[PDB]
Design a protein around this nucleic acid. Structure first.
Lengths: 52, 51, 185, 49, 148, 58
RNA sequence: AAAUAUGUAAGAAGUCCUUGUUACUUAAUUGAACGUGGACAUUUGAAUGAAGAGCUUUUAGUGGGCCAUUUUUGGUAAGC
RNA sequence: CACGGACCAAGGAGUCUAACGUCUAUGCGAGUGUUUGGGUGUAAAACCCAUACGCGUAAUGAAAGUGAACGUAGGUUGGGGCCUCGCAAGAGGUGCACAAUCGACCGAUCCUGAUGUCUUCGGAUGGAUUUGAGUAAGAGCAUAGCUGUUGGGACCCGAAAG
RNA sequence: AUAUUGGCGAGAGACCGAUAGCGAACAAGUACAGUGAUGGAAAGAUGAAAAGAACUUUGAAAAGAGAGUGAAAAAGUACGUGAAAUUGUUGAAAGGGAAGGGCAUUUGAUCAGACA
């Protein structure tokens, strides 16, 4: 009642709990879900071979 | 639809009662804003000094 | 010893990461570094730079500008991306579906788009729906509409609004502004 | 004295101004005093409003 | 925040960002606006044209409450109706049911014709209006009532 | 108490540290100083032909 | 009448053909300007290079200079 | 063969404020600012708030005053990103910000000055080598920070004087 | 309702911590100076407790050496700690009108690190 929600709003004049700029704070799940992994090239090595 | 926090009794003994989350806990957690607000707000019970 | 054709140890002149201490925007940046690195899509490189941008360089994109841009031909069904803030404009009254993606939506713009039926989307949702940025319009907003740009280049015969704290007669309408008093500009 | 493109300024601090500065540290104290005045008036005085 | 300053970084360095030649001095061109006509003239010309001289007429004992007349544009006229009622009146555009708008009550003394309200009848109560505002409202089927 | 009046010494170095750049010409320059008669006619001509395109090309 | 120094150009905002607008101009739908439409493209109209090109804002110090080669004034000359 | 410095300790010099500019961060956003004050209080904190007021959303002109869509809020030239064809090179479509440009709109100035009628009032319409710190789908308000400006004892010390 | 660096009584501090902070933490507006108006300081700290050294010895005494009190006199009223400039003693090293420094090694002195 004090801080509001999707249902209730009251106890603060025109106050709205602020809004996320990212749906998921975990980016591993986003990167590894399905479609990005479909849409990305294969990868190399975490550390490169040295040439010459 | 919300994680259903259980209520607990004074002598331990967790109750059979569970309440939804008030959405304040799905609010965003911004350490930077808490930082700035805290500095400015903790400056506000200050008391003047001068020679 | 070397005769250098250019300044040594010169930085690129481009912001390589955001100054913001915002955890969530750094997470977006992490996502889009990955995408620009692994997708070969120009879209995600653009969105990454625009994430790095500052506020005056992320001016707000009006919902009326979104509607204007969806009145383009072949573009009604494009998702409209704004790496910034989408503000409302009551001066429109007929507003379409508009799948819109952006960092921040105001209450008014959010309400407007949801009432017209469209969906207000984060850039991570956009990434999940569109890794290469398929079917998209990037909309930048007006930078040289600012009170400060009103003053840049201030000199004679250039017309760029003196820096002044009190506007009116007795404040810089005299000599230098009119032939009757010495000269004009 | 005069410099790059900056607005012309009008600051009235050429008198002995820091003989007449007033800082309001008494703000909350006077609020409490004012509330106790109203309450002790409404007590001492009457059932009047 | 004193510690994120450059006096910190100039501890050790003799002149403190001020030069070994100028040898920072107190008021070496005058104080404030000394020299607008003599030795700061090029500053004032170019970046402050207009500064020196008189312009027009004096108004002795001028109130601004007289000249209070904040303006409103047609593109912001419908913002004076509550959002709950705005769609209601917008649909079903009918005379004998046309909205009334108290522009003075909203804080607006004159009404201006910037742009393109919808083709709905409206009753605009305003102390003043412009010609194109009157034309656009009457073309959209409304009317302007004048008030005091 | 006499001074060094004038010298153009070092000044080309100064000018070339930031370089004498061309004024970066453009298409469609200013029609400033161009004859007003020409300017009026040219306005009416452009209006007529753009009207022709708007009024023919469907 | 030099040497040195100096301006311009070395093509896509280009060249070619046909043809619209005009209240300007012409004796004249002749010209001028802007153009539609079509044609010529990757040795596209010299060389070399291009430790990225273009643009903006803001601000510091400075605003006593001295030396050498060469040109050169004054002065008998001068570390003038 | 200029000045200061015999030595040691301690002290010791760009600070604070009012208004400001550029940049940056944050919050809300065509709006913003709770903290003059009122409520409340585990009390000079934290929490809550009406009416306003400020700046902004409309300029222009000495003023009287007037007051921002011919047209998918214009056209052209470029323009990232997207779309279509292709395996590609590349071709076309759409093109935000932005730059340049010819136009339109508003105000001032100079003109033309109609229908009309306290017959001197009125101002339609159409213009211009003229002019604005303008419009042409808003961007601002507030807090904080470095740098910089002005007033201040104003980086510290220093006159002869009045 | 407003002001209020004086007085009185109270409560506090992102203040100073005895060259600071009021001039004054102390017999400070004191001592002192000046005809006068006026000027105007320095100066805190033994130790829990004086328990502040009985007694012997040398010395004319001051004191010393002992003894002793005390957790400690490496706390003795010239007292918390007790830096530096400066000095004494001892030790070590070098030195033909300066010394000092840098690189590199000799010589002497001193020193850590390691095999399961």
């Amino acid at each position: 009642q004090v801080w509001g929600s999707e249902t209730v709003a009251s106890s603060k004049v025109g106050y709205t709990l602020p809004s996320h700029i990212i749906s998921t704070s975990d980016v591993t799940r986003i990167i590894n879900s399905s479609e990005i992994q479909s849409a990305i090239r294969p990868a190399g090595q975490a550390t490169q071979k040295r040439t010459h | 639809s919300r994680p259903q926090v259980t209520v607990h009794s004074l002598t331990g003994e967790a109750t059979a009662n569970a309440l939804p989350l008030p959405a304040v806990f799905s609010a965003p957690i911004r350490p930077d804003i808490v930082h700035t607000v805290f500095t400015s707000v903790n400056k506000n019970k200050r008391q003047a000094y001068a020679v | 010893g070397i005769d250098h054709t250019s300044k040594q140890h010169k930085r690129s002149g481009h912001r390589t990461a955001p100054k913001s201490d915002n955890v969530y925007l750094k997470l977006l940046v992490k996502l889009y570094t990955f995408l620009a690195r692994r997708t070969d899509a120009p879209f995600n490189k653009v969105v990454l730079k625009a994430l790095f941008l500052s506020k005056i360089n992320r001016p707000p994109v009006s919902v009326s500008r979104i509607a204007r841009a969806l009145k383009q031909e072949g573009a009604a069904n494009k998702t409209v991306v704004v790496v910034g803030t989408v503000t409302d404009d009551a001066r429109i009254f007929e507003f379409p579906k508009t799948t819109v993606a952006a960092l921040r939506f105001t209450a008014g713009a959010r309400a407007k788009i949801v009432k017209a039926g469209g969906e207000c989307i984060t850039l991570d949702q956009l990434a999940v729906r569109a890794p290469k940025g398929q079917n998209t319009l990037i909309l930048r907003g007006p930078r040289n509409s600012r009170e400060a740009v009103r003053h840049f280049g201030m000199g004679p015969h250039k017309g760029k609004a003196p820096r002044i704290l009190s506007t009116g007669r007795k404040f810089e309408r005299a000599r230098g502004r009119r032939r009757s008093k010495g000269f004009k500009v | 004295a005069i410099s790059k493109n900056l607005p012309i300024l009008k600051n009235h601090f050429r008198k002995h101004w820091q003989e007449r500065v007033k800082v309001h540290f008494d703000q909350a104290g006077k609020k409490v005093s004012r509330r106790n005045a109203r309450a002790t008036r409404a007590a001492k005085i009457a059932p009047r409003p | 925040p004193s510690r994120f300053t450059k006096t910190r970084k100039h501890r050790g360095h003799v002149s403190a960002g001020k030069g070994r030649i100028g040898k920072h001095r107190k008021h070496p061109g005058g104080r404030g606006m000394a020299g607008g006509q003599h030795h700061h003239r090029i500053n004032m010309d170019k970046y402050h044209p207009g500064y020196f001289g008189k312009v027009g007429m004096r108004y002795f004992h001028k109130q601004q409450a007289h000249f209070w007349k904040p303006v409103l544009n047609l593109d912001k006229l419908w913002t004076l109706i509550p959002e709950d009622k705005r769609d209601q009146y917008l649909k079903s555009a009918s005379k004998e049911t046309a909205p009334v708008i108290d522009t003075l009550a909203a804080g607006y003394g004159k009404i201006l014709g910037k742009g393109r309200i919808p083709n709905v009848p409206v009753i605009v109560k305003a102390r003043f209006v412009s010609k194109l505002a009157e034309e656009k409202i009457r073309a959209a089927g409304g009317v302007v009532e004048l008030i005091a | 108490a006499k001074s060094k009046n004038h010298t153009a010494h070092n000044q080309t170095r100064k000018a070339h540290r930031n370089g004498i750049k061309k004024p970066k010409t453009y298409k469609y320059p200013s029609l400033k100083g161009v004859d007003p008669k020409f300017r009026r006619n040219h306005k009416h001509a452009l209006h007529g032909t753009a009207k022709a395109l708007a009024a023919a090309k469907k």
